[PDB]
PDB file of N, CA and C and ligand atoms in Angstrom:
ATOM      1  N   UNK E   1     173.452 -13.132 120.461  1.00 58.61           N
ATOM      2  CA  UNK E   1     172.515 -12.322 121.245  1.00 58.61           C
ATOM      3  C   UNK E   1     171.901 -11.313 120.279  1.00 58.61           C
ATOM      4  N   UNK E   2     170.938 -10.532 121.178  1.00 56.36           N
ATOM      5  CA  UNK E   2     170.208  -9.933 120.347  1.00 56.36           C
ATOM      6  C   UNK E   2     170.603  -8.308 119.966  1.00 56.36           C
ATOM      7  N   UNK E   3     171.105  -8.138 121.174  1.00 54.21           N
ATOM      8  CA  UNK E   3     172.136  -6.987 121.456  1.00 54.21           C
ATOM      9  C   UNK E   3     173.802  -7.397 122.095  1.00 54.21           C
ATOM     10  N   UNK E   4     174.474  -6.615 121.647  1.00 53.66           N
ATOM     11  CA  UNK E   4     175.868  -6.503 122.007  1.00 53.66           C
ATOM     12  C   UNK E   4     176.305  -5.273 123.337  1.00 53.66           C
ATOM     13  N   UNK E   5     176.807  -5.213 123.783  1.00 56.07           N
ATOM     14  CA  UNK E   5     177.430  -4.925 124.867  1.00 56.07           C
ATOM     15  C   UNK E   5     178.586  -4.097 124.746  1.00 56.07           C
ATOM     16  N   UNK E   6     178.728  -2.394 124.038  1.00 58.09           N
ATOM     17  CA  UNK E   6     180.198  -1.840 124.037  1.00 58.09           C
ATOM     18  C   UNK E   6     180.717  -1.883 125.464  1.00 58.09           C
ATOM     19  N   UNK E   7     180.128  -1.391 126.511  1.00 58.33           N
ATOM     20  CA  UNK E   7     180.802  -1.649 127.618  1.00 58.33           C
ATOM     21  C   UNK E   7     180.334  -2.016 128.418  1.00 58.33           C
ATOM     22  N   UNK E   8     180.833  -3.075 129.474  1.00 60.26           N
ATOM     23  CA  UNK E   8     180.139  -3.829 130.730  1.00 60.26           C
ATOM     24  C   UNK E   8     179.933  -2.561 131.867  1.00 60.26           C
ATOM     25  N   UNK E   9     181.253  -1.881 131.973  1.00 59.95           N
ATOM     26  CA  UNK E   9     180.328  -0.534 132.647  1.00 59.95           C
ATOM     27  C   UNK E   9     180.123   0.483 132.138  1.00 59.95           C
ATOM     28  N   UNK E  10     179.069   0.954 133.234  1.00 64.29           N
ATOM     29  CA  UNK E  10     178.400   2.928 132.945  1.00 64.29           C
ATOM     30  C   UNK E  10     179.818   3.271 132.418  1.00 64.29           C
ATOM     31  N   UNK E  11     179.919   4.192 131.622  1.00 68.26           N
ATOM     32  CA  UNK E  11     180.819   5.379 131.631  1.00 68.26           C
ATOM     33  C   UNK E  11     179.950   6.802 131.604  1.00 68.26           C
ATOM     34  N   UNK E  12     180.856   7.595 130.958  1.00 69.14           N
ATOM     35  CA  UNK E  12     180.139   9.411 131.770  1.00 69.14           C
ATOM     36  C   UNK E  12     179.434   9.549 130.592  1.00 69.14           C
ATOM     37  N   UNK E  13     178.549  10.402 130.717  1.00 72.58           N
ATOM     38  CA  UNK E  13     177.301  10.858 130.230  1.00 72.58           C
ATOM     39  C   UNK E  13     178.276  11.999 128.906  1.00 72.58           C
ATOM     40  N   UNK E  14     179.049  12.249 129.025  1.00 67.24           N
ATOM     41  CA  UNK E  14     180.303  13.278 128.402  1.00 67.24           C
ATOM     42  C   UNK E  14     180.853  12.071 127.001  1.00 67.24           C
ATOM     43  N   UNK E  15     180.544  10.850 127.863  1.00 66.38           N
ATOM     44  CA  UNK E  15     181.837  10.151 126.457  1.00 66.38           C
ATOM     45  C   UNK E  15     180.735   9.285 125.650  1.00 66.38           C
ATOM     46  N   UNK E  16     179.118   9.416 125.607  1.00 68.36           N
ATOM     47  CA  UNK E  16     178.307   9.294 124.657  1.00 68.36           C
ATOM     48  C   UNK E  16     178.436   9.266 123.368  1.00 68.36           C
ATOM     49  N   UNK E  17     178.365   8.321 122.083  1.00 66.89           N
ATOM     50  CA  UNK E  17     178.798   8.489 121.125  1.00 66.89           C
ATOM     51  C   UNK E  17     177.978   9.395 120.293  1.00 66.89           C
ATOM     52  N   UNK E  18     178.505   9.603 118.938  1.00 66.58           N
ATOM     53  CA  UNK E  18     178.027  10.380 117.801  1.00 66.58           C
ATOM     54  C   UNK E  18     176.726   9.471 117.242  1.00 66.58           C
ATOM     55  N   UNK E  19     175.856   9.227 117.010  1.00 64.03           N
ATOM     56  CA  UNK E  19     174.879   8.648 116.450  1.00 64.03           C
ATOM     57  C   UNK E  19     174.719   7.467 117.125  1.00 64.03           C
ATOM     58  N   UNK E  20     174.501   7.684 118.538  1.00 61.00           N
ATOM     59  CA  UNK E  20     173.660   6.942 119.488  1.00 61.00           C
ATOM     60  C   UNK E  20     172.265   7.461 119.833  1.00 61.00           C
ATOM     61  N   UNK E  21     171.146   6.672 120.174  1.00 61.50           N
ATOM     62  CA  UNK E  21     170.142   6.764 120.721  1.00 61.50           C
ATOM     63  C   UNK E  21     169.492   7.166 121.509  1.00 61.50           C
ATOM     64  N   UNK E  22     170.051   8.122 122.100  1.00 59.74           N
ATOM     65  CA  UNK E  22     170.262   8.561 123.721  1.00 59.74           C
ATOM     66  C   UNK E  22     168.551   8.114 124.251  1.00 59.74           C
ATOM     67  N   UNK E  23     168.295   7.517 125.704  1.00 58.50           N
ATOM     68  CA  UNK E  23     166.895   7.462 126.425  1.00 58.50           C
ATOM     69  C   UNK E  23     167.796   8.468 127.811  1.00 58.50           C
ATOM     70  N   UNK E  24     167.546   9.466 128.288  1.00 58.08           N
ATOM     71  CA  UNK E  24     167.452  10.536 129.572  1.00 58.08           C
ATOM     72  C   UNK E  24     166.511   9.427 130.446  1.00 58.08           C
ATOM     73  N   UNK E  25     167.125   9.705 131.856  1.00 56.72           N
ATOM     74  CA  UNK E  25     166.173   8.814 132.870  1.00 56.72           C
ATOM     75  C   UNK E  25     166.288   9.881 133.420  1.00 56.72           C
ATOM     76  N   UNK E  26     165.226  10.313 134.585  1.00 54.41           N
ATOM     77  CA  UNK E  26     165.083  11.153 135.289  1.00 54.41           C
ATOM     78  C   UNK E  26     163.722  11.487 135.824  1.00 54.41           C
ATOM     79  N   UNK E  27     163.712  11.974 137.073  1.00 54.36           N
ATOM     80  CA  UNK E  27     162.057  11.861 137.540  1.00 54.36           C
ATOM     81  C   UNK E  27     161.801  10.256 137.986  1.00 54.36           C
ATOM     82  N   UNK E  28     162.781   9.416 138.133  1.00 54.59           N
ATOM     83  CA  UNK E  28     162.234   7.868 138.230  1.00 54.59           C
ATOM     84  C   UNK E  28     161.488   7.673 137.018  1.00 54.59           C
ATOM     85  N   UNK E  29     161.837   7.845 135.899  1.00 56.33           N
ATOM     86  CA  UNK E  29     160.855   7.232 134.371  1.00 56.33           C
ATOM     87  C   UNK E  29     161.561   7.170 133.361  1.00 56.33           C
ATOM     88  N   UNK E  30     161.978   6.275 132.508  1.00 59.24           N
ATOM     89  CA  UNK E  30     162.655   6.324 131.211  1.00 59.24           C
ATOM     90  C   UNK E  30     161.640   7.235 130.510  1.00 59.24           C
ATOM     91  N   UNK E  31     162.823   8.159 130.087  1.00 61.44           N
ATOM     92  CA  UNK E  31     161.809   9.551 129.297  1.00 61.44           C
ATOM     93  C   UNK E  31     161.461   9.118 127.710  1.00 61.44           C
ATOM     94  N   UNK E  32     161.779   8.077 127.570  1.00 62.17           N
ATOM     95  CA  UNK E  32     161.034   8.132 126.359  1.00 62.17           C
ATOM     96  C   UNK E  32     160.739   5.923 126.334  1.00 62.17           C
ATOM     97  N   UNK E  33     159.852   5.781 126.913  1.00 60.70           N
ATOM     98  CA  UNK E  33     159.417   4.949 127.253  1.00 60.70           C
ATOM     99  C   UNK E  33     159.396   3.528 126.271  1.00 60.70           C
ATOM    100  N   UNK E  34     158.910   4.295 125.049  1.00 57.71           N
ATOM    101  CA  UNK E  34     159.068   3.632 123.744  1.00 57.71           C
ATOM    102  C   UNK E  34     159.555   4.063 122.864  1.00 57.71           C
ATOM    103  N   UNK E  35     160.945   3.647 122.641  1.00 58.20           N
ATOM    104  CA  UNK E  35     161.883   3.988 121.571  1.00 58.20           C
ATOM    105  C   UNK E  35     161.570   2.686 120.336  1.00 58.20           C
ATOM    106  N   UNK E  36     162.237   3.509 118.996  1.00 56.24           N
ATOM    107  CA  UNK E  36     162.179   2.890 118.157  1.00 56.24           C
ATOM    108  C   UNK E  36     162.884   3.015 117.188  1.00 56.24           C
ATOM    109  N   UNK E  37     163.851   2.071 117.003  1.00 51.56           N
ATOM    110  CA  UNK E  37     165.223   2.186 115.900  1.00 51.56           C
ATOM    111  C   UNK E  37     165.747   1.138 115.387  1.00 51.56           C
ATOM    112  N   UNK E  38     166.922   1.109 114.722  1.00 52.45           N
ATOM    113  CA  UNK E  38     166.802  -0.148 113.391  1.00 52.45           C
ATOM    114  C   UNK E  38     167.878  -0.630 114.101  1.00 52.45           C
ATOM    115  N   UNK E  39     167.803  -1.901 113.384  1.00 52.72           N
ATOM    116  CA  UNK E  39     168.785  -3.165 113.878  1.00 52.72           C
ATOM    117  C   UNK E  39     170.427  -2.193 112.979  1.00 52.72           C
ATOM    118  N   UNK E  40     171.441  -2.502 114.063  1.00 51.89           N
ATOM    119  CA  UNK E  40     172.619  -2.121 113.975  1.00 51.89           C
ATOM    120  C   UNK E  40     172.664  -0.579 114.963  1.00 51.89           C
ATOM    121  N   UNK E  41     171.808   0.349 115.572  1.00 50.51           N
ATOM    122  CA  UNK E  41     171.667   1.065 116.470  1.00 50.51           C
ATOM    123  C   UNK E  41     172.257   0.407 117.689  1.00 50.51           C
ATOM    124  N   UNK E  42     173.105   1.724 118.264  1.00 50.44           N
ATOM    125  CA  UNK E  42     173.124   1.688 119.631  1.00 50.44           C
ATOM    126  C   UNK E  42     172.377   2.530 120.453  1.00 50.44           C
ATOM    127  N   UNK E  43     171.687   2.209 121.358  1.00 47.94           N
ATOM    128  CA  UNK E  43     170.864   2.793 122.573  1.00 47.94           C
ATOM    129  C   UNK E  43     171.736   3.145 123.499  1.00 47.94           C
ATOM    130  N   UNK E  44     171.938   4.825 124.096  1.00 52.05           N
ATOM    131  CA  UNK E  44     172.607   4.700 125.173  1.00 52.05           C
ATOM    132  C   UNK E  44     171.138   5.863 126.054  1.00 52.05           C
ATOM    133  N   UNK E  45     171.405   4.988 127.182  1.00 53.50           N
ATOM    134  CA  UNK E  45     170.519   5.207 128.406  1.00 53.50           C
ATOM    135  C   UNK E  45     171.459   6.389 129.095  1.00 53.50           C
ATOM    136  N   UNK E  46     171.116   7.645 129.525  1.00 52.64           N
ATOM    137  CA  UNK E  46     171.761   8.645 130.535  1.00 52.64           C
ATOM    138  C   UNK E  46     170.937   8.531 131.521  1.00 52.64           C
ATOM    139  N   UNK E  47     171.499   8.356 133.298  1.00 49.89           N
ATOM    140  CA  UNK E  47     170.846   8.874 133.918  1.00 49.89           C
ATOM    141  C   UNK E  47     171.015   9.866 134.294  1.00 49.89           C
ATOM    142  N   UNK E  48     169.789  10.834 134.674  1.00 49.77           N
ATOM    143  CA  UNK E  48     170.449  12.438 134.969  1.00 49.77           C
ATOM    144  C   UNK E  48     169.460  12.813 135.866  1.00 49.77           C
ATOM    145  N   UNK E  49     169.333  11.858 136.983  1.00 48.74           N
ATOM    146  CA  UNK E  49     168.849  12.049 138.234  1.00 48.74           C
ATOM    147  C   UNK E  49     170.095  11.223 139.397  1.00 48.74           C
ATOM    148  N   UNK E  50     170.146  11.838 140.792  1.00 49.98           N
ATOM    149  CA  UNK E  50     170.665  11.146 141.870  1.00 49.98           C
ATOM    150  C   UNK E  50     170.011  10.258 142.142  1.00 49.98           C
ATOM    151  N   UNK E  51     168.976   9.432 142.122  1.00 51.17           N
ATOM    152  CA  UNK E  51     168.951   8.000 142.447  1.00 51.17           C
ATOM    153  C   UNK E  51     169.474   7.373 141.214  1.00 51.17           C
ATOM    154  N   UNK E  52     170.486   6.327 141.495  1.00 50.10           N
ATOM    155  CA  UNK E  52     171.192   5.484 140.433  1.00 50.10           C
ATOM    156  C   UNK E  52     170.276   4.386 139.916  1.00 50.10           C
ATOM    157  N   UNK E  53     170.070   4.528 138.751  1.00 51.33           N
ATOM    158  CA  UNK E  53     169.044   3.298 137.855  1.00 51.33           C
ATOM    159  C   UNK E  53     169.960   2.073 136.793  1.00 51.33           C
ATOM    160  N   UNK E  54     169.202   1.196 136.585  1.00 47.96           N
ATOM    161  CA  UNK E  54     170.098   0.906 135.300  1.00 47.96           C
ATOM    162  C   UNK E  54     168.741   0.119 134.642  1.00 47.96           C
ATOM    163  N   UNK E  55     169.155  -0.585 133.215  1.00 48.05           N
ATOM    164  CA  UNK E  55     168.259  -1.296 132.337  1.00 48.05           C
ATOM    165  C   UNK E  55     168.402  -3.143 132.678  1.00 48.05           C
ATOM    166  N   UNK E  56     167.309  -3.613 132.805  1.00 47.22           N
ATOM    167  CA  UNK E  56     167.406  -4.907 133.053  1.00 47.22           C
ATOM    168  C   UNK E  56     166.279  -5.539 132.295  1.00 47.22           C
ATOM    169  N   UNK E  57     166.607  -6.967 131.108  1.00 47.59           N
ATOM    170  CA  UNK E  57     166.051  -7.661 130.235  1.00 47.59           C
ATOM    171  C   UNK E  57     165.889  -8.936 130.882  1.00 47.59           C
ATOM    172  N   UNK E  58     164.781  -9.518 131.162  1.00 46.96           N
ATOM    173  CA  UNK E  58     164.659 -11.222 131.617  1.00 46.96           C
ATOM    174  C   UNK E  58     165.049 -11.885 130.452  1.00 46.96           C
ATOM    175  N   UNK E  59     165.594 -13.187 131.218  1.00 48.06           N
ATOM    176  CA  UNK E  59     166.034 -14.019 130.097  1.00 48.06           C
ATOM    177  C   UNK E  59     165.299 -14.482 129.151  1.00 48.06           C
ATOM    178  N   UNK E  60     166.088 -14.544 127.797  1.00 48.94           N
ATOM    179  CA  UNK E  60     165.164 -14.478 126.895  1.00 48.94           C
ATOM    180  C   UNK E  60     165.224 -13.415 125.612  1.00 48.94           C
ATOM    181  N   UNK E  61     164.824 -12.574 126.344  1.00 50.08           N
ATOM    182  CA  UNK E  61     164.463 -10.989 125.579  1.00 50.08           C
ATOM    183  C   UNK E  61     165.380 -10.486 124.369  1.00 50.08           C
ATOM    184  N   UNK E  62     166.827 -10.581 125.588  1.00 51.58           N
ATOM    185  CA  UNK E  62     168.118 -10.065 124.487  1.00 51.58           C
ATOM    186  C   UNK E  62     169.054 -11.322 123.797  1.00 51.58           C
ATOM    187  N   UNK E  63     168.456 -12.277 124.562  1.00 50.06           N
ATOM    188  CA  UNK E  63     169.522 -13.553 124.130  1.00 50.06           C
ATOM    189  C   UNK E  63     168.750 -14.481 125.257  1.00 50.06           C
ATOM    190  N   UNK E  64     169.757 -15.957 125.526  1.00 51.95           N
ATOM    191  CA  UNK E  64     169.145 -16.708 126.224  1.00 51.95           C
ATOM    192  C   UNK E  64     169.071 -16.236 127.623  1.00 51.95           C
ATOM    193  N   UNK E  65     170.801 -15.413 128.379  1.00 50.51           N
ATOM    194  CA  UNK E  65     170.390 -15.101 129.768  1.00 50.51           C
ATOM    195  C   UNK E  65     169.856 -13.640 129.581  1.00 50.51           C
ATOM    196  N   UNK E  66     169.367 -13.382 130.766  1.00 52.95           N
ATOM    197  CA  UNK E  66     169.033 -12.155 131.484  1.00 52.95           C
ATOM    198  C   UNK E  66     170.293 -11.161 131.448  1.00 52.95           C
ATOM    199  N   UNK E  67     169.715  -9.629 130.880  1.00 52.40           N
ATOM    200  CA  UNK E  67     170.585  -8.881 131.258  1.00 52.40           C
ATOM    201  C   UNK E  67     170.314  -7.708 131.695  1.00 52.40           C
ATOM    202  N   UNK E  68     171.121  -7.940 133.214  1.00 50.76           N
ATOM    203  CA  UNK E  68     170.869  -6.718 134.656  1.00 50.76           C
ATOM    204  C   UNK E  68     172.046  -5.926 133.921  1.00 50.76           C
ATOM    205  N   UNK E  69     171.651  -4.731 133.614  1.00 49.81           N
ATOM    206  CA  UNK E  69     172.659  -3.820 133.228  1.00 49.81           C
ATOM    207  C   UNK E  69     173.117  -3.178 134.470  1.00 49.81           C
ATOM    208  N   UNK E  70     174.299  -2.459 134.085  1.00 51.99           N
ATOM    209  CA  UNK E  70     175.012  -1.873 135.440  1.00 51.99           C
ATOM    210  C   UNK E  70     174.351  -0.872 136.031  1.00 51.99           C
ATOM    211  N   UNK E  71     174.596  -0.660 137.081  1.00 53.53           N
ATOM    212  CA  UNK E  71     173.774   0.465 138.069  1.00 53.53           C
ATOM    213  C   UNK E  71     174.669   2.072 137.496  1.00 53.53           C
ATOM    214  N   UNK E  72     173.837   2.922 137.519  1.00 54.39           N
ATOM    215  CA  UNK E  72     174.106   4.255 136.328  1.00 54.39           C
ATOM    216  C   UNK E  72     174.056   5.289 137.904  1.00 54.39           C
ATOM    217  N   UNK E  73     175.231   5.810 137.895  1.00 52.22           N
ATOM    218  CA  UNK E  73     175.034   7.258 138.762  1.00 52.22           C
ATOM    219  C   UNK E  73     174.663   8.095 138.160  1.00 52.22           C
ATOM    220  N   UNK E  74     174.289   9.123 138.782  1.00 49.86           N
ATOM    221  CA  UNK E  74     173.767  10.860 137.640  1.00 49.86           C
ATOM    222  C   UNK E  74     174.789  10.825 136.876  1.00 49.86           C
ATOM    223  N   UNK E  75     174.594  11.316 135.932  1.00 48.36           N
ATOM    224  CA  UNK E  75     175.659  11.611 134.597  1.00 48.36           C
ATOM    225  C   UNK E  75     176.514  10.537 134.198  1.00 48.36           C
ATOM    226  N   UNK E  76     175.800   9.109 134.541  1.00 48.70           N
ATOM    227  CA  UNK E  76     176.537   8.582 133.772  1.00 48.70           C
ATOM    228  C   UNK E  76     175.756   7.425 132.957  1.00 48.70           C
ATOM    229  N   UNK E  77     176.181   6.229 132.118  1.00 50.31           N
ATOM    230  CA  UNK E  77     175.139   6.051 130.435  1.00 50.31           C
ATOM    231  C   UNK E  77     176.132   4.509 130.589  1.00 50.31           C
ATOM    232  N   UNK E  78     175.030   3.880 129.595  1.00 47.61           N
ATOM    233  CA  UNK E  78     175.025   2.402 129.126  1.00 47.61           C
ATOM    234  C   UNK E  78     174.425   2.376 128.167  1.00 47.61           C
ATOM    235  N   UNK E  79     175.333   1.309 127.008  1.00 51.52           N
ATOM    236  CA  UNK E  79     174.934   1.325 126.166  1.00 51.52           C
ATOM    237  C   UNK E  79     174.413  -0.206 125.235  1.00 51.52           C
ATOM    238  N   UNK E  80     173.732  -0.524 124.854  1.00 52.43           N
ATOM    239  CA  UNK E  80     173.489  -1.444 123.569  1.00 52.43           C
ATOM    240  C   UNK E  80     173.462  -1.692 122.384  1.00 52.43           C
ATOM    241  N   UNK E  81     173.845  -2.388 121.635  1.00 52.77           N
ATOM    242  CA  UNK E  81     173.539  -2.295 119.907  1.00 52.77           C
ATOM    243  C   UNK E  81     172.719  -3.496 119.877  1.00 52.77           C
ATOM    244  N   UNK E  82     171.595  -3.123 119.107  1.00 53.28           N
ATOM    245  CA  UNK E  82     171.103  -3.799 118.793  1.00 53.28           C
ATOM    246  C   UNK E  82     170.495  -4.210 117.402  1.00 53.28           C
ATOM    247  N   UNK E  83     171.343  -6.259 117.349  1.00 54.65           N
ATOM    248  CA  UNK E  83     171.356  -6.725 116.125  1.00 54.65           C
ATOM    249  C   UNK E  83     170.059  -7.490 115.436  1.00 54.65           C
ATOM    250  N   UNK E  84     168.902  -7.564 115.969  1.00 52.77           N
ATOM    251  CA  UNK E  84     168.157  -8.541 115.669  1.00 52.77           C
ATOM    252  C   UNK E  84     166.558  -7.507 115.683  1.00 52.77           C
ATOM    253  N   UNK E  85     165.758  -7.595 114.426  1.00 55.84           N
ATOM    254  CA  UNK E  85     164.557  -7.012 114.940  1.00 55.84           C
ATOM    255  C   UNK E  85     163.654  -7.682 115.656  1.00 55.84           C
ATOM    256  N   UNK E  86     162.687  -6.829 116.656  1.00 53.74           N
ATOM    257  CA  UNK E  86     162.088  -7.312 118.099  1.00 53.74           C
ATOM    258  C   UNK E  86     161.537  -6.667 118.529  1.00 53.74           C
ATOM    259  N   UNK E  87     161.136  -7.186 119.904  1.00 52.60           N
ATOM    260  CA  UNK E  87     160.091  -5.763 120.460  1.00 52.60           C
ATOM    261  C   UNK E  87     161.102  -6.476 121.985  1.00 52.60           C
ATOM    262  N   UNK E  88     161.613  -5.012 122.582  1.00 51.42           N
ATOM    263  CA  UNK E  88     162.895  -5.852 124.377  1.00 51.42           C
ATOM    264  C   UNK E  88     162.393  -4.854 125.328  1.00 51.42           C
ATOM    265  N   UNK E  89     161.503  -5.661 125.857  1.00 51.62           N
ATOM    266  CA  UNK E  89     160.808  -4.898 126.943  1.00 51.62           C
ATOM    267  C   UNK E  89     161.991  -4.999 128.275  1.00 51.62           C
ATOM    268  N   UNK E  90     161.713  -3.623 129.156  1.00 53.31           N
ATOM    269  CA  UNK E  90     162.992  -3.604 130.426  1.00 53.31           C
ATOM    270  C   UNK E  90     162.522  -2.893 131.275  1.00 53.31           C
ATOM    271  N   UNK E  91     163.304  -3.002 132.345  1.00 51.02           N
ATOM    272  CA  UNK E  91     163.263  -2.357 133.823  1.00 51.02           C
ATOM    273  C   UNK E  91     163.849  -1.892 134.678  1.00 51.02           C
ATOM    274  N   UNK E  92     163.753  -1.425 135.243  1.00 50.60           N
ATOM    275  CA  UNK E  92     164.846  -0.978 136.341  1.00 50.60           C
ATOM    276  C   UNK E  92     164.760  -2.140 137.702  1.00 50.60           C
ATOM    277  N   UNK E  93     166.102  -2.685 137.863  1.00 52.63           N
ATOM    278  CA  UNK E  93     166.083  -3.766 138.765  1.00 52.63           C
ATOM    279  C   UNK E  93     165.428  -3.047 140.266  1.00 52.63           C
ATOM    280  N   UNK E  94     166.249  -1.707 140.774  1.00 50.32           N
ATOM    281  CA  UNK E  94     165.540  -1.811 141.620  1.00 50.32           C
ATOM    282  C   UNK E  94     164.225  -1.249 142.215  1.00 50.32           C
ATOM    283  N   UNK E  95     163.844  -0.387 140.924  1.00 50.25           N
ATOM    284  CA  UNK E  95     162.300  -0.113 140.223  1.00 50.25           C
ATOM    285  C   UNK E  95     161.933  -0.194 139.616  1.00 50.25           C
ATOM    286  N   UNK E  96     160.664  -1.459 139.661  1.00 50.61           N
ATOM    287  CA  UNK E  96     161.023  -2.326 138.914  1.00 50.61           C
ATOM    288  C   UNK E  96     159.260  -1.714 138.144  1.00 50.61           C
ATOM    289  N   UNK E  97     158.715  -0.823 138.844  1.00 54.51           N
ATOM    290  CA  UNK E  97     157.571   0.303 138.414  1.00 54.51           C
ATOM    291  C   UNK E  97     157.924   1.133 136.802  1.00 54.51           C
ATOM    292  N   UNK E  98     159.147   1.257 137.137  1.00 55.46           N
ATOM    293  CA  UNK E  98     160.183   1.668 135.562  1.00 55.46           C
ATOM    294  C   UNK E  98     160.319   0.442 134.600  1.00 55.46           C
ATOM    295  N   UNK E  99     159.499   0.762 133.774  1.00 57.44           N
ATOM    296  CA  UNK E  99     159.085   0.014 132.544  1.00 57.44           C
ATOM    297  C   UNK E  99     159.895   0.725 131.216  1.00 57.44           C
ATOM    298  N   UNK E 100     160.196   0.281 130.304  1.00 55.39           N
ATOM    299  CA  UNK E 100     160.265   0.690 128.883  1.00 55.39           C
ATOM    300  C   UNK E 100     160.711  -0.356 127.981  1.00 55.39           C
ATOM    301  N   UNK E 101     160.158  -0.021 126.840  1.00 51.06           N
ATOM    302  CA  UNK E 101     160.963  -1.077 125.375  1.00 51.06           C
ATOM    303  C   UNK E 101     161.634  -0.231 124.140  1.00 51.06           C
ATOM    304  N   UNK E 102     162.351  -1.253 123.914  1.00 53.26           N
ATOM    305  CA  UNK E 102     163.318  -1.246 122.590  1.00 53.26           C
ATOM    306  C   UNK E 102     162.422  -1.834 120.986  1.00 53.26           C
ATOM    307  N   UNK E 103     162.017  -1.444 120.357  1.00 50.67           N
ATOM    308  CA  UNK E 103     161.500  -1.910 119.360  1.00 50.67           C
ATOM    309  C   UNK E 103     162.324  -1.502 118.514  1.00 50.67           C
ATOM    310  N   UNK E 104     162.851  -3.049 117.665  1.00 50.86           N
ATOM    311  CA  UNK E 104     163.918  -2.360 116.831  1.00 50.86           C
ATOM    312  C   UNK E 104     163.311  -3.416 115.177  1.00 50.86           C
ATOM    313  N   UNK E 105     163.438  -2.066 114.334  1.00 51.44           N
ATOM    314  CA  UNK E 105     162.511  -2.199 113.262  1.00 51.44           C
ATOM    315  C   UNK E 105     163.460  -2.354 111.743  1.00 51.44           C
TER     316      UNK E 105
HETATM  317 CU1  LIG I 201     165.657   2.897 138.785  1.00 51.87          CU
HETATM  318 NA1  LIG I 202     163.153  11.551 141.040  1.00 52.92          NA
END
Protein backbone atom coordinates (compact mmCIF):
# COMPACT_ATOMS: atom_id res chain seq x y z
CA UNK A 1 0.00 0.00 0.00
CA UNK A 2 0.64 3.36 -0.33
CA UNK A 3 0.20 4.27 3.22
CA UNK A 4 0.45 2.18 6.38
CA UNK A 5 -1.89 2.18 9.15
CA UNK A 6 -0.25 2.77 13.00
CA UNK A 7 -3.61 2.30 14.31
CA UNK A 8 -6.98 0.89 13.07
CA UNK A 9 -8.51 3.15 15.74
CA UNK A 10 -8.87 7.00 16.62
CA UNK A 11 -6.89 7.37 19.71
CA UNK A 12 -6.79 10.86 21.85
CA UNK A 13 -5.72 13.89 20.38
CA UNK A 14 -3.12 13.89 23.76
CA UNK A 15 -1.20 10.64 22.46
CA UNK A 16 -0.22 12.40 18.94
CA UNK A 17 3.25 11.69 18.04
CA UNK A 18 6.51 13.82 18.00
CA UNK A 19 7.05 14.64 14.29
CA UNK A 20 3.69 13.95 12.93
CA UNK A 21 1.77 16.03 10.49
CA UNK A 22 -0.97 17.13 12.37
CA UNK A 23 -4.38 18.32 9.75
CA UNK A 24 -7.06 20.09 12.81
CA UNK A 25 -10.69 19.42 11.44
CA UNK A 26 -13.05 21.75 12.66
CA UNK A 27 -15.78 24.11 11.37
CA UNK A 28 -16.78 20.93 9.06
CA UNK A 29 -13.35 21.58 6.83
CA UNK A 30 -9.99 19.92 6.90
CA UNK A 31 -8.00 23.03 7.97
CA UNK A 32 -5.41 22.64 5.87
CA UNK A 33 -6.89 21.23 2.81
CA UNK A 34 -3.66 20.67 0.97
CA UNK A 35 -0.95 19.24 2.81
CA UNK A 36 2.35 18.43 1.61
CA UNK A 37 5.09 16.06 2.92
CA UNK A 38 7.64 13.42 2.04
CA UNK A 39 7.28 9.81 1.65
CA UNK A 40 8.04 8.11 5.15
CA UNK A 41 5.71 10.98 7.04
CA UNK A 42 2.97 10.31 9.17
CA UNK A 43 -0.25 12.44 8.84
CA UNK A 44 -2.27 12.59 11.90
CA UNK A 45 -5.80 14.13 11.37
CA UNK A 46 -7.32 15.80 14.95
CA UNK A 47 -10.78 16.36 15.13
CA UNK A 48 -11.56 19.25 17.36
CA UNK A 49 -15.10 19.80 16.62
CA UNK A 50 -18.37 17.71 18.13
CA UNK A 51 -19.56 16.40 14.95
CA UNK A 52 -17.38 13.16 14.55
CA UNK A 53 -15.48 13.06 11.02
CA UNK A 54 -13.00 10.73 9.72
CA UNK A 55 -10.67 10.44 6.32
CA UNK A 56 -11.86 8.21 3.51
CA UNK A 57 -9.63 7.18 0.15
CA UNK A 58 -11.58 5.30 -2.89
CA UNK A 59 -10.08 2.38 -4.00
CA UNK A 60 -7.16 2.80 -5.61
CA UNK A 61 -5.70 5.98 -4.14
CA UNK A 62 -3.83 4.37 -1.09
CA UNK A 63 -3.52 0.84 -2.39
CA UNK A 64 -5.92 -1.44 -4.27
CA UNK A 65 -8.99 -1.25 -1.58
CA UNK A 66 -10.67 1.76 -0.31
CA UNK A 67 -9.84 3.24 2.90
CA UNK A 68 -12.91 4.49 5.22
CA UNK A 69 -10.90 5.61 8.11
CA UNK A 70 -12.41 5.42 11.55
CA UNK A 71 -15.01 7.83 12.71
CA UNK A 72 -12.90 10.59 15.04
CA UNK A 73 -14.82 12.11 18.17
CA UNK A 74 -13.65 15.74 19.33
CA UNK A 75 -10.24 15.26 20.57
CA UNK A 76 -9.54 12.45 19.08
CA UNK A 77 -6.79 11.64 15.73
CA UNK A 78 -5.86 9.04 13.01
CA UNK A 79 -3.09 8.46 11.63
CA UNK A 80 -1.09 7.46 8.23
CA UNK A 81 2.42 7.01 6.96
CA UNK A 82 2.89 7.52 3.96
CA UNK A 83 5.28 5.31 1.70
CA UNK A 84 4.92 6.04 -1.92
CA UNK A 85 5.06 9.58 -3.72
CA UNK A 86 1.46 10.77 -5.07
CA UNK A 87 -1.10 13.09 -5.04
CA UNK A 88 -4.38 10.96 -2.22
CA UNK A 89 -7.21 12.88 -2.60
CA UNK A 90 -10.06 12.23 0.57
CA UNK A 91 -13.21 12.79 2.28
CA UNK A 92 -15.22 12.65 4.86
CA UNK A 93 -17.60 9.58 4.47
CA UNK A 94 -20.31 11.24 5.94
CA UNK A 95 -19.44 14.72 4.36
CA UNK A 96 -18.61 13.95 1.72
CA UNK A 97 -18.57 18.22 0.79
CA UNK A 98 -15.15 17.73 2.99
CA UNK A 99 -12.57 17.38 0.48
CA UNK A 100 -8.70 17.35 1.02
CA UNK A 101 -5.30 15.77 -0.34
CA UNK A 102 -2.13 14.28 0.70
CA UNK A 103 0.60 15.16 -1.74
CA UNK A 104 3.51 13.41 -0.79
CA UNK A 105 6.73 14.66 -2.46
CU1 LIG B 1 -17.10 14.90 8.47
NA1 LIG C 1 -19.01 22.95 12.70
Amino acid sequence: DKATIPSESPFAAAEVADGAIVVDIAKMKYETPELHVKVGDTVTWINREAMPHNVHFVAGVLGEAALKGPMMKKEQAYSLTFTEAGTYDYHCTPHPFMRGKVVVE
